[PDB]
From a paper:
A major challenge for the utilization of AAV vectors in the clinic is the presence of pre-existing neutralizing antibodies (NAbs) in a large percentage of the human population. This study structurally characterizes the interactions of 21 human-derived neutralizing antibodies from three patients treated with the AAV9 vector, Zolgensma®, utilizing high-resolution cryo-electron microscopy.
In each map, the capsid was well ordered, while the densities for the Fabs above the 2-fold axis could not be interpreted for model building. As for the 3-fold antibodies, only a single Fab bound to the 2-fold region, in two potential binding modes, resulting in distorted densities during icosahedral averaging. For the sixteen 2-fold binding Fabs, this strategy resulted in maps reconstructed to 2.54–3.56 Å resolution. The localized reconstructions with C2 symmetry relaxation confirmed that only a single Fab is bound at the 2-fold region. The epitopes for the sixteen 2-fold Fabs comprise VR-III to -VII, and -IX of the AAV9 capsid. Other frequently contacted residues are T491, T492, R533, D556, N562, N704, and Y705, which are clustered around the 2-fold symmetry axis. Furthermore, for all the 2-fold Fab-complexes, movements occurred in VR-IX near the 2-fold axis. While, for AAV9 capsids in absence of Fabs the residues 704–707 adopt the same conformation in both symmetry-related VR-IX loops surrounding the 2-fold axis, there are numerous variations of side-chain orientations in the different Fab complex structures.
Residue numbers in the entry:
A (entry chain L): 23 to 126
B (entry chain H): 21 to 147
C (entry chain C), E (entry chain F): 225 to 322, 352 to 382, 411 to 649, 675 to 736
D (entry chain A): 244 to 288, 342 to 360, 375 to 424, 478 to 526, 537 to 579, 592 to 681
F (entry chain E): 433 to 487, 570 to 579, 592 to 610
G (entry chain D): 244 to 288, 342 to 360, 375 to 426, 478 to 526, 537 to 579, 592 to 681
H (entry chain B): 433 to 487, 570 to 610
Amino acid sequence: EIVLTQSPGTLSLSPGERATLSCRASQSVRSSYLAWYQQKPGQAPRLLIYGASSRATDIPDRFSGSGSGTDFTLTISRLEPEDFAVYYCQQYGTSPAFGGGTKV
Amino acid sequence: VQLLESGGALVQPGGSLRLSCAASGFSFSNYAMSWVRQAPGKGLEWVSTISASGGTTYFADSVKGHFTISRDNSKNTLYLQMDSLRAEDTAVYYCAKDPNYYDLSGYFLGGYYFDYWGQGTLVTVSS
Amino acid sequence: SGNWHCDSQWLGDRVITTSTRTWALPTYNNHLYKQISNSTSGGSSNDNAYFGYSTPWGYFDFNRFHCHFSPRDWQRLINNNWGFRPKRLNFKLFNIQVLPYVLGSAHEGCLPPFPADVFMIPQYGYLTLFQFSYEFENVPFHSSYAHSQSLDRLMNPLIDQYLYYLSKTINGSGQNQQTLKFSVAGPSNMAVQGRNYIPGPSYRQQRVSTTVTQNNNSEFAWPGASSWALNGRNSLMNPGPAMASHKEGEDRFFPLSGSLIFGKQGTGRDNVDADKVMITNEEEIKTTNPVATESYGQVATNHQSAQAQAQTGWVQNQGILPGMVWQDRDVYLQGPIWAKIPHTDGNFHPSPLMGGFGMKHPPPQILISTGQVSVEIEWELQKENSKRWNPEIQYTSNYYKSNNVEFAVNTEGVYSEPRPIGTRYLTRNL
Amino acid sequence: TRTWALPTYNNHLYKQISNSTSGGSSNDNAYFGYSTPWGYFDFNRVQVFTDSDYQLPYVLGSAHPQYGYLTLNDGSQAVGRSSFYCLEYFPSQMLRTGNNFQFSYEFENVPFHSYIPGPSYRQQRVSTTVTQNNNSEFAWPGASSWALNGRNSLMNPGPAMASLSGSLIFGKQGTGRDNVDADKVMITNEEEIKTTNPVATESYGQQTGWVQNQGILPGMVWQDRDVYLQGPIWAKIPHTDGNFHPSPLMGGFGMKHPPPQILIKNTPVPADPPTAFNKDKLNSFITQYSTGQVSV
Amino acid sequence: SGNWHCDSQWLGDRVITTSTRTWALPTYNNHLYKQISNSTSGGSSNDNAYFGYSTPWGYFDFNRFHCHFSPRDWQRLINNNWGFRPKRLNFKLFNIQVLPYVLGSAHEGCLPPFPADVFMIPQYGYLTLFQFSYEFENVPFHSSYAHSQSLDRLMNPLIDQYLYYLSKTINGSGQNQQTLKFSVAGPSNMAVQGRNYIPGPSYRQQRVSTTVTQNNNSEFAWPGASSWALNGRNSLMNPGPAMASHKEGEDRFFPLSGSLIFGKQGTGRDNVDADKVMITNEEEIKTTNPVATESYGQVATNHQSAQAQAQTGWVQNQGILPGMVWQDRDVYLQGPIWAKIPHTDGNFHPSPLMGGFGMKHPPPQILISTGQVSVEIEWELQKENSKRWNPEIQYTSNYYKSNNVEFAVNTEGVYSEPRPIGTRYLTRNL
Amino acid sequence: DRLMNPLIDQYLYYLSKTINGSGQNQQTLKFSVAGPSNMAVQGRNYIPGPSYRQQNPVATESYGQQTGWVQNQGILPGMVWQDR
Amino acid sequence: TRTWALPTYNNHLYKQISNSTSGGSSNDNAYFGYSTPWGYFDFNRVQVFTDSDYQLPYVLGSAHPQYGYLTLNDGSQAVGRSSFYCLEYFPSQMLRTGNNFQFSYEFENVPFHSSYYIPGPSYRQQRVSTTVTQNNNSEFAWPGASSWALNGRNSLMNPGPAMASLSGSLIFGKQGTGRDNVDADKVMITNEEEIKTTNPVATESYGQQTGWVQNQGILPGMVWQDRDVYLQGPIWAKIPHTDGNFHPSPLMGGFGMKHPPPQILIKNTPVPADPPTAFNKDKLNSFITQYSTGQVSV
Amino acid sequence: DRLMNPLIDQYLYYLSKTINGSGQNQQTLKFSVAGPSNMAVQGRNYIPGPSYRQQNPVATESYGQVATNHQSAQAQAQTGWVQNQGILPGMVWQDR
């Protein structure tokens, strides 16, 4: 199969700061599409990115990601109180799979 | 788009139940549909996907043989039946939607990111 | 020296389509005739060996359908009609500001789908071993309908046949149980009934799963493809005889070469992913045609006897037999219109294999700075008389909100065609 | 000229039918369709209208009364393309006991019924001496077939070849319906045609290999299948982009516009309706059937 | 004495539909006339108070649409045309075997939609304090299209207006900051621009959601419903003025009394669940008509002064103003065709509220064992001329497999219509 | 408003019931056939003319109707009225 | 007669414009639409075609150059009912330097504009005084405004029903007036007071335990006068195509017409630059810069 | 089979590449334009005529190949030689 591993574990946010995060996937045969999800607790999740470099419909320009091959990243700026949460990278090239998640 | 889940109830191990996702706000026959589980101690995990016409259904190895997914286009509802449940199956099961539109012109390329998320029903297997 | 004519006119059983575009013709080969060959490009393989010439001339190409039909006019055509075909052609070249027939090989360089787009005239060439009017020769109506009945189910379900078939060859378990029993063919068993017509021809294809993990872990693109060898070179069979792309209710599989594959807007020339290119499946023809990826049937391979069992082998490719019916391949908004029939002693069912109207005298080549071009084709229509009670399947644009309306420009001004569109929506009896 | 007895069918009602309503069958045997209250006149071996536009499904070329039609299926289920035809929805002439009905029909031009040999699809050989047969069940397993949309269907009678499934078999008078021995049925043989046609059970031709089936080749001449006193006369040609040698494989004359269907039913006359208005349809009818004279 | 006619002819700009049904006429009230009122049935409320007679006479009512159209003929109509209206009428009654105008009230007892059904005649009745032909008086075409623009977006997005609006009434935070500031109405702010025309009238309804948990936990069916009072009797407002059913994106909400609701085949009389009925929406007219559950707008309720702020109030019901434009209510396959305009000294826009054609002289009542009815209406069509580039939304059957075919009969021979079908698919510019 | 046929049912439904009974979380939608038994809730094609209250509709009665009363009504499409 | 200067717009490209393109951020002002390379002539105060079937969106009635139109939207997105019109898909006339173009139009019959039982309708407005101190010291421009809601969006009621003198008047600029936040002496505020006899005052109640009538629809017995026309004001309008309307005369004044004078659409035919000489599939994005000028007499 | 214009690309695609190679579990589908670089794989409207093997296609050559099975994870795509081929719609042939 394909194993996905979130590189950063965690950090906590006070508003105004910004940081980036990534995940590495074993084999990483197809890199065109990967998706990033952000989950608020106690309620259904919501989408962020769709495709290696394409931002979502209701998501602010400051959300971004890039990658190809095994390594992929999620690069976000102007990062505000609502954004301290878990980040999920999905590799759907094969049957869908998630990384463990990175809670920033 | 409104996805609604029914049939999530406590079930003792070795006992089955049938979840149903009643959907509206989209065509629903032209889009593939997936189930994705979240165990309270863990994050999101994908279970199975069914195509818009129902021709193709694939599963995760974790759920293989206990689970089956079917859909009824006429009734606009998505079914997931869980048989011979174990204790490791307890979670909120979310009904998720595929972005890609499906016609008899064209094929099913597979699963993609999950567009929209219903309010997941919560199944607990414990005795 | 000319005006701007773009529209469509729907009158009775005919359609008048008018397309006017802007062209730009560079000087090619710098006013010379150059020789080109595989060796000039390196000639890596035997099958790709070629020889011929390249000429300075350009040509106007309007073979594809979307040139002549707006996406609305195409919908208006396919939902309301059981057939269509061209009648008369009119060409005008104006506002100028300074042979081998290659039009039928599905080449690029035709007028842009969108009238505000300006295009570059292609370079003419061939291989070896102002206004005018045109008249289309008589061709059969393209069949833009899908059969509502299948070839094997034409029977009346309520009544037995008077024919008899052989139901049982033995009494039971033991030695010397041989017997011959004859049941009558009846609705309880419809497989065994005698039939007047049999499904069309087949030349088998290899099925590729769109889910890649189910496919074999090897390179089978060429080694496992269907092919036909001409004069020692093996040519790929593409798209091939018209056959259903998949069985009823199978969306995942497609025949390897057995389809026409269109690229989406902005798609790269080499090694693009499956999402990038639009594959077309001819599944509307399953009712009368064998599936491209399945065998035609079985045949007995021997004479049974006391010590020998009846044996059957598989029939991979089947020719023509008396009593066959079939459907031709469908035509698309992005597909070719006509193809010139190769001049030969004889041919069978000359209709071309990529779709469209085969013609022995197709529209001639126009050989030829910037200017304008206005092409006008007259199309004849065939209305539906169907008595069907329940509503048909229609081509519809999805109502749900999206970032960009389909078949239109984006924010950056690029016209796109989001999906391949077939002509078969309305239905008929078989 | 005959005299017909036509009853009421389905109590003036259209019934969706499927293999599941018939017990479920198997994959090759699956079907979906509708059965109609209307009857029909089949000589191919009160309300009435003929379908001259061929707008209804044509059942008369199946070598088979009640009329019903089959449509597309995935199984015991119907797909979107499947169509439903209401026979009430044509104009029809309603004849009382003294009224007459007649129509004339002009046949379209067709050939009079009569280099390497013609095409072949091999058949298994069966001996009328049961001791020469093999001691196993080879009826279906050893039978030549063709598959359409994933369903197998026996090749019957198939391309014309000179004498298993490749011959017409007629029943003797009062023949039993099921599992009847050979002397109960009349098994025809085509061997008249062995001049221009290959032996049905023999290979077509030919290290080397045996060629079991051969499609059309330029330079073939062949004879069509024989016609019989019991056999069919004509068969409709399926409306399609292409066909080859449209003559039907059971024999007779293939026609793009064959003789039309003639549909007949007893006009429903309701029984005594209730004395207060009920919007539901009336299911209470007077038991009835009709009779008359047929001439062609 | 007659024949059976059940086919339709689509000829040019006209449609000729001919239906024929089998009927049964009993004797009502045993050949008697009888006074009837509520005092017989107990008449608990003055709202239900009625007085009238019941006659042994029957009548034939073909008024609903699905009498004259098949599901395919209805599709063929609504996809291809911007308008229609009836022209002539033909009624025939044959094969016999042994005043107050009530036809405009959407009663049951009309000829069945499926030609193989035998229908029973409704008994004639009224309240108070063989063949013939007919000529429909001239009515405006029904508008079977949905606007491709909205009333407030008619403007050119690229250009400023030459009108000014008052942007600022003060400079900023502080005492004595009053000012008058004027800005150019332009693309950046479209809300404040001046416009020539305003949306149609609104008479407010109450909003109910198909999701029961979002509704209030109290009984408001009759209490919370809009109504109009006449001489001490409160009539529910049904369906009421034509207004959009819901705002864009909210499909679970519908006006309480504001929509036309149909039963599914086999649905009981009283207190059926929401899955048994087919609620209808007027979302097509949202562009020029106010949402039924929203206020029309706001007004000034006072004078502002140094001591008085600007106060506003909501307009729940707005009548006609000069300049308004509105769409009438859509017609459905199951809905009524015509009504009779009440004879009065004056009326405004007589088009009936349940949809269809208002007529001062509608098709006359037919007052009348068993037999045959054959009714024939002629229809006039208004063709679609639009230049729209991208494809339309069309009414379509569903591609997927199912147990039963929609608009057909099941295994027991019951005929049903799965959903209501409107006439508005094609579009026009506002 | 009485123009209906008293003997026949409409094919139109009205919402008759928003709750099963007394209790908590009892919400429901029940629909019934509007017909002779209840003539107030039936669908109608025409409504009375406009009214501006004095201290056809009645002069001292409100035109119609949480809800609130209509103390004046302008013209609406579908109205009929008698002159003076 | 004038002399026109027509530039080349949007690189000869049709382009989707929407709410998010302009920065969005507001739902009431959200829109979705297109901008065209074609220009047009507006007197309501090289290729050419007029729309005599009225098949294009009609922008000449908004009291406003480059031609653009708006279609249906949800948010800034596009519902399937949204239309896209390519103006290249009309037949048009192509004029070289010596060529000319003209057409004649016949106005459909309208009554003469008047220039001179109970009073007519009213929809009340807020009263604003030109003296700043007389007005309340608070931001009441949008909060105190008269609006009508359509599909959840609140548009100002402007100018509104015809009444005698906030938003109920036409406001014109004085020569050299800024585009943003200009003072009160830089704008001309018209008055309709000529009609004050037959019509109610815009800022007043229509009439009347009693209670106030802040808006009154039409009644039998109402007489009213429409809005006067101005030398700087509009002439006509296009009556929207609908099942019904009342008193089609437009609210900004002038002559309402269901088939008003046709739009006149014009553009400069593109001339491509040097082609690459090696055949390419792509469309040509390289255009020789060009612009035109000429004469127009209406 | 050479009737094409050698200077231009088709707008049609073929499946060039099924696996990345030199590894386990490498599987993909890559599509390339059909063009002058590889002319064996282009879609053609007409195919050569019939053949009956001897000891228009060459008389001593097999007409072509077909797929004789369904490939899968455990099954390699198999072919078979067509020794004789009857008429197919679209064939052209020269007589003797």
